[PDB]
Design a protein around this nucleic acid. Structure first.
Ligand SMILES: [Mg+2]
Ligand SMILES: [Mg+2]
Ligand SMILES: [Mg+2]
Ligand SMILES: [Mg+2]
Ligand SMILES: [Mg+2]
Ligand SMILES: [Mg+2]
Ligand SMILES: [Mg+2]
Ligand SMILES: [Mg+2]
Ligand SMILES: [Mg+2]
Ligand SMILES: [Mg+2]
Ligand SMILES: [Mg+2]
Ligand SMILES: [Mg+2]
Ligand SMILES: [Mg+2]
Ligand SMILES: [Mg+2]
Ligand SMILES: [Mg+2]
Ligand SMILES: [Mg+2]
Ligand SMILES: [Mg+2]
Ligand SMILES: [Mg+2]
Ligand SMILES: [Mg+2]
Ligand SMILES: [Mg+2]
Ligand SMILES: [Mg+2]
Ligand SMILES: [Mg+2]
Ligand SMILES: [Mg+2]
Ligand SMILES: [Mg+2]
Ligand SMILES: [Mg+2]
Lengths: 121, 152, 140, 121, 278, 155
RNA sequence: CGUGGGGUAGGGGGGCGCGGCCGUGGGGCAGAAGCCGGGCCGUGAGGUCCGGUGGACCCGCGGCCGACGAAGAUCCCGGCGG
RNA sequence: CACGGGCCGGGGAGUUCACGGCCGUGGCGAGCCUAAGGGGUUCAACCCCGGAGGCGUAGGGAAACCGACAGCCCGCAGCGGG
RNA sequence: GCGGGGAAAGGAAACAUCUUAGUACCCGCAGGAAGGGAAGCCAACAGGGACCCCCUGAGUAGGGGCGACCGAAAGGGGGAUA
């Protein structure tokens, strides 16, 4: 087949470059692992609905999503989520549940080592 | 979006064009016949890999009858867990009219004809549906609501 | 001509030796047939091709093992880095210690005079002033 | 009446195949500034007996009378713009009407005056 | 709300040129600074050249026409193959007095073209509406940066600032001579002058088919609504496009598929931009 | 603005009780008698009348009443009447030879069935699809390719 | 870093050329394309320059699209040989 | 001692549509897209409208008919502790 | 465009039912279009409302060595409206 080229979006290319630098700078394997998952082919990119965050995460959890966060199900928990991108329904459901939505570069700046961060795919 | 060069660009100079030298590019005899043929004689091994053993059912044979679509109902069920999302969405738009002190939802006006029992109901609500499953009526009851069955 | 560093002087000497001994890459019987005598290299995919199979006593096939050194690859024989120039405004941003000017082949004689005078005063080695331009400036 | 199509093939087709009454409009030449003030019209098709000034070519600067006009070729013959063939006779150079300026007008034709009023008005 | 839009990549990636200003400068018709207006949301879109290229190619591809050959070309001769035994190749040949002459095959003179262009071929590259409008916002934001507009080729050395917005009084200019002053007073005339001397008789067969001249792009003028007098006053300049803001598209915002077009916005058009393409 | 009649889409058994509305053919006679007009007067004013329809809808009546007041108060211009404004009948040559008499119509099947279900219609319709390579005729054997592909992938 | 360096059918990855289009930058009567010979560059497809001939167009770079690459088919058409 | 070509020039072969599978990317995302068609336009481009319909969201059964999860364990990455 | 007469090659990897195809072709007859067109209709107890053409319904129902393959209609959205 046409072998995997990687993303054509430059915003995704820079974020992939950003995470690899943050992994090297901080010796945090979470950023390198997130970079590998973000760089996957478009037909297998990670997507998560907010309903799944009810199960895999509890209140006070800081969650990084290596892809898109979709708005599905109902979120009854307070969680800090960082995503590659968030739909308007997912952002509203996260905020009104008491959580807060972060960009991935913002989470690295706030938490350089990524200690206690839970990856959700 | 990414663009790729055609295989014909690569095949100029290759004599056989990817078809081989021994088994070259021939007419429909190179396929085993024209169209979807040979599945009982020489492509029977393909039926034995996908269809049922012995009969080769989905490729060949009859099974049952079809109830006519002009006298049967097209069903548009919705689970109560999904129905919980819809009432919240309608509640914020001011569409739902509060009449008995609970919220009242008319399934037919929404476009659904049946109520199913998947998910959770967390609010008291009145649902008009010509058909509601057993677990669906229970879960609406547990949330304080009721199901009213309306005949067509 | 162009003063290269010592690592780039040996490679340029070595690249000259590789150019001297490089085989000319021709198809089989190219010397025999007038219909293909002026053609480029063709790696013909045939049953009895003895050049692809590298038989001793036959012509040689094209391979990446014949590649010249990467540092001096593509340089003019004087060592400079050739730059095609089509007008005097094209002379901006050129280092005379690094770049040798090659005037465009279709540049007119009227412009070639105006190019060569500016290029010469900047110190650039102009490869191809032309016979007409050389005679005029010689006469001045 | 000359194609309004922008395609060059249709423009060239109408010009070559134009009938005689349409080729008269290709004989138009610029009047001199004196004649423009004397007539008020900026152009007139060149007529036999008009005095013209050649404005381009080898005979640029020569002024003479128009001895002949050709509708088919759209060329004009002017005295002075001549030469001699190998046998010694004197022959005329065919000048396109757009390369001359009418410095004197032949207005003895009553039909020409009516065309003068049409363009000044 | 735009945190995912303009992604902050510090400190492990150095930031690039700053975003468009929070307020857009406004100049009078005499070229002097008069007031300031808030930047619409369209100018905060990140410049995405690949999306711009895709959306441009879709718009360009929908204008092409279906081409073909005659359905019977090379196929209407009375010909037939005469088999073996005559010492000649077994391609079809003429049946009559021209008998040995080959016919109908692709390798024969006068034969049919083997795989000719087909009029039913799909030349249009379809694009989703939301995707196409996202690219239009992206190409709009590319006009806010001096880097992109200088990259596309325009001369912006005399341009006081980008995005270049002028007052809404410019819509009453009805003459080309009056409009030429406003371009000169706003530092736009050098780029219009660039397109004038850049017109060239293009190489190849396009001269035969009505494409003799190749003319660069100079300035896109955005007016508030259709039929303003400024449209007829600027449309004659070489390379200048003039469209109402509701008629914006990728063919004027990214010529050649590359973002960044020297654009003169009127102040009223900027106000009307807040409810379009989003 | 001329009002447009609003009728009910016929509720099918397959629908399961889901209903919607549509622009009907014209205002019913029952709806017109509640505003004082018959079919001739309504068509003269320019309304589209459907004498076949029997139902009456109050939304149809209100739109008639509001529009009728504007017309009769000189605040609105009515359209041209909904009646035939031209009579073009061509001379018929060779009716017997083109099968247009009663015997030819009976032989073609127009007496006993509809034009769409007649056999000459079916011949012409399938020929136009194949000539233009239309919806299902762009691929021959499309049903059998689909059936075998569904087995192989949904096995 | 590799007790890495053969390769038909075939699978995968990159590049050169031809005609047009969207852009950008240029050249040309002080001589464009084409043609003959030659130097230089590139493993190579090829590029580029010089001298002669010619007389009006053409080319570099980014993107896109094809009626897109011949040594052969008792290949087709023409021309011309022993 | 298997068959094809005397030579040279020019020509000469994986195309398009429909449907299906899959891949590489892009948009949106429990939703996605409009088709025909309609208005405007600097007029086949372009902007706007058009959600009919199609696919997805629920399956089982010939059919009548019925109609669905966070409980536990192992455990890669990742994280925290030594 | 309308009425009638009416194949085979090929496909089914043979072939006869079948398909190709009511096609090629033939005979007859009109117009600038033709034909169709105004409920002994469709529906399902709720309602549409002459006709033609476009999108769809849909390769669904169904036909068929139940093989190859063939294949609607109602309904919905439009053009136009008498
Ligand atoms: Mg094979
Ligand atoms: Mg074999
Ligand atoms: Mg073969
Ligand atoms: Mg069998
Ligand atoms: Mg049975
Ligand atoms: Mg061998
Ligand atoms: Mg030359
Ligand atoms: Mg021909
Ligand atoms: Mg394409
Ligand atoms: Mg050429
Ligand atoms: Mg069919
Ligand atoms: Mg090898
Ligand atoms: Mg290029
Ligand atoms: Mg060969
Ligand atoms: Mg011959
Ligand atoms: Mg002889
Ligand atoms: Mg043989
Ligand atoms: Mg021989
Ligand atoms: Mg056939
Ligand atoms: Mg057969
Ligand atoms: Mg047979
Ligand atoms: Mg007759
Ligand atoms: Mg008619
Ligand atoms: Mg009639
Ligand atoms: Mg049939």
């Amino acid at each position: 087949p046409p072998n995997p080229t990687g993303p054509t979006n430059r915003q995704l290319r820079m974020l992939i470059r950003f995470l690899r630098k943050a992994a090297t700078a901080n010796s945090a394997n979470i950023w390198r692992a997130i970079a590998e998952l973000v760089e996957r082919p478009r037909r297998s990119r990670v997507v998560v609905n907010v309903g799944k965050l009810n199960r895999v995460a509890n209140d006070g959890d800081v969650v990084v999503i290596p892809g898109k966060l979709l708005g599905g199900g109902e979120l009854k928990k307070r969680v800090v989520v960082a995503a590659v991108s968030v739909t308007p329904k997912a952002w509203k459901k996260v905020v009104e549940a008491g959580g807060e939505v972060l960009t991935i570069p913002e989470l690295v700046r706030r938490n350089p080592k990524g200690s206690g961060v839970k990856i959700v795919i | 979006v990414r663009r790729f060069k055609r295989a014909t660009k690569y095949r100029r100079g290759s004599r056989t064009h990817g078809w081989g030298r021994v088994g070259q590019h021939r007419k429909s005899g190179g396929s085993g016949g024209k169209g979807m043929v040979g599945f009982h004689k020489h492509k029977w091994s393909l039926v034995m890999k996908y269809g049922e053993s012995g009969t080769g059912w989905p490729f060949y044979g009859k099974h049952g009858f079809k109830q006519p679509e002009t006298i049967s109902v097209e069903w548009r069920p919705i689970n109560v867990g999904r129905l919980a999302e819809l009432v919240k969405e309608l509640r914020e738009r001011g569409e739902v009219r509060e009449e008995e002190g609970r919220l009242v939802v008319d399934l037919l006006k929404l476009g659904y004809n049946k109520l199913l029992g998947g998910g959770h109901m967390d609010v008291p609500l009145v649902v008009y549906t010509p058909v509601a499953s057993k677990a669906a009526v229970e879960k609406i009851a547990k949330a304080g609501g009721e199901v009213r069955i309306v005949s067509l | 001509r162009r003063e290269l560093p010592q690592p780039l002087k040996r490679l340029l000497r070595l690249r000259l030796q590789m150019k001297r001994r490089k085989p000319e890459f021709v198809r089989i019987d190219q010397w025999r047939y007038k219909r293909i005598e002026d053609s480029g290299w063709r790696n013909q995919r045939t049953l009895d091709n003895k050049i692809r199979r590298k038989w001793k006593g036959w012509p040689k096939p094209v391979e990446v093992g014949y590649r010249k050194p990467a540092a001096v690859r593509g340089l003019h024989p004087s060592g400079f880095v050739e730059v095609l120039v089509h007008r005097p405004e094209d002379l901006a941003g050129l280092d005379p210690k690094v770049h040798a000017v090659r005037i465009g082949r279709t540049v007119g004689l009227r412009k070639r005079l105006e190019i060569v005078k500016k290029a010469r005063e900047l110190g650039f080695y102009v490869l191809n002033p032309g016979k007409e331009v050389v005679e005029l400036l010689k006469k001045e | 009446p000359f194609t309004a199509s922008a395609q060059p093939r249709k423009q060239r087709l109408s010009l070559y195949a134009a009938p005689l009454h349409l080729r008269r409009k290709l004989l138009n030449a610029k009047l001199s500034p004196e004649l423009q003030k004397k007539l008020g019209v900026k152009r007139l098709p060149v007529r036999r007996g008009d005095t013209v000034l050649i404005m381009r070519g080898d005979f640029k600067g020569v002024t003479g009378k128009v001895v002949k006009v050709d509708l088919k070729r759209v060329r004009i013959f002017v005295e002075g713009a001549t030469r001699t063939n190998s046998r010694g006779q004197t022959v005329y150079y065919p000048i396109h009407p757009s390369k001359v300026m009418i410095v004197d007008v032949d207005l003895s034709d009553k039909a020409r005056q009516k065309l003068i009023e049409r363009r000044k008005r | 709300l735009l945190k995912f839009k303009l992604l902050d990549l510090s400190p492990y990636i150095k930031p690039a040129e700053e975003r468009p200003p929070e307020a857009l400068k406004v100049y009078d018709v005499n070229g002097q600074y008069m007031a300031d207006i808030e930047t619409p949301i369209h100018f905060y879109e990140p410049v995405r050249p690949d999306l711009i290229r895709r959306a441009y190619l879709s718009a360009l591809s929908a204008r092409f026409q279906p081409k073909g050959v005659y359905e019977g070309a090379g196929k209407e001769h009375s010909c037939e193959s005469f088999g073996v035994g005559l010492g000649i190749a077994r391609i079809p040949r003429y049946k009559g007095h021209l008998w040995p002459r080959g016919c109908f095959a692709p390798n024969t003179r006068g034969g049919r073209r083997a795989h000719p262009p087909r009029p039913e071929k799909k030349l249009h590259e379809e694009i989703n509406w939301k995707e196409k409008n996202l690219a239009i916002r992206s190409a709009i934001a590319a006009t806010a940066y001096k880097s992109w507009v200088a990259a596309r080729g325009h001369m912006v050395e005399k341009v006081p600032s980008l995005p270049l917005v002028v007052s809404g009084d410019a819509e009453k200019i009805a003459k080309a001579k009056e409009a030429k002053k406003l371009f000169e007073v706003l530092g736009l005339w050098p780029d219009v002058e660039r397109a004038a001397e850049g017109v060239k008789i293009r190489a190849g067969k396009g001269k035969m088919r009505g494409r003799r001249y190749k003319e660069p792009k100079s300035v896109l003028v955005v007016v508030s609504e259709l039929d303003v007098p400024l449209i007829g006053a600027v449309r004659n300049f070489p390379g200048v496009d003039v469209v109402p803001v509701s008629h914006l598209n990728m063919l004027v915002l990214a010529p050649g598929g590359v973002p960044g077009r020297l654009t003169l916005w009127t102040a009223t058009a900027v106000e009307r931009l807040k409810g379009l393409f989003l | 603005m001329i009002p447009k009649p609003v009728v009910q889409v016929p509720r099918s058994i397959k629908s399961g009780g889901v209903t919607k509305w549509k622009e009907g053919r014209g205002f019913s006679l029952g709806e017109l008698k509640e505003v004082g007009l018959n079919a001739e007067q309504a068509r003269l004013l320019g309304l589209p009348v459907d004498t076949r329809r029997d139902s009456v809808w109050p939304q149809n009546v209100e739109a008639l009443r509001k529009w009728l007041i504007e017309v009769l108060e000189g605040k609105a211009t009515p359209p041209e009447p909904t009646l035939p404004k031209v009579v073009k009948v061509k001379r018929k040559r060779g009716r017997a030879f083109r099968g247009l008499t009663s015997a030819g119509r009976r032989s073609r099947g127009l007496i006993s069935t509809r034009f769409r279900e007649t056999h000459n219609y079916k011949f012409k319709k399938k020929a136009k699809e194949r000539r233009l390579k239309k919806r299902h005729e762009a691929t021959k054997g499309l049903g059998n390719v689909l059936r075998i592909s569904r087995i192989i992938n949904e096995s």
